[PDB]
Amino acid sequence: KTCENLADTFRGPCFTDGSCDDHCKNKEHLIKGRCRDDFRCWCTRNC
Amino acid sequence: KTCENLADTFRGPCFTDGSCDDHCKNKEHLIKGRCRDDFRCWCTRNC
């Protein structure tokens, strides 16, 4: 099971999925990240 | 498992997928690469 929640410390609006995926993978050590239609970065994690 | 993450020491913006694929395969000895919407080079590797 996996869970999608807001990034903890991503800065500013989320315009690029790459910026969010980078944050989620490399700062939070989670599975992946994407921007959603809210222009925020959401990370997926094992849950 | 495969993993996609940022290239190591790909210089400059990623505006052409083939330049990234080349880097990832030939400089980093990974599977493949592509530019993403962050204009960075992302490599896929066995992990």
The domain ranges of chain B are 1-47
CA-based nearest distance B15→chain A, Å: 14
Radius of gyration of chain B from Cα atoms?
Answer: 9
Q: Where are the beta strands (DSSP E) in A1-47?
A: 2-6, 32-35, 41-46
Q: Would you call A25 and B5 a contact, using CB atoms and an 8 Å cutoff?
A: yes
Alpha-carbon span A17 to A43, nearest angstrom:
11
**Do residues A41 and A5 lie in contact, with contact meaning Cβ atoms separated by under 8 Å?**
no
Resolution in A: 1.0
**If you search the block for the tokens 């290239």, which residue do you land on?**
B7
Contacts of A25 in chain B (CB under 8 A): 5
CA-based nearest distance A20→chain B, Å: 9
B17 backbone dihedrals φ, ψ, rounded to 5°: -55, -40
For residue A31, how far is the Cα from the chain centroid?
9
* Secondary structure element (H or E) that encloses residue A22, with its range: helix A17-22
Q: Pull the structure tokens for residue B13.
A: 């913006």
Domain A1-47 listed as CATH 3.30.70.1380: no
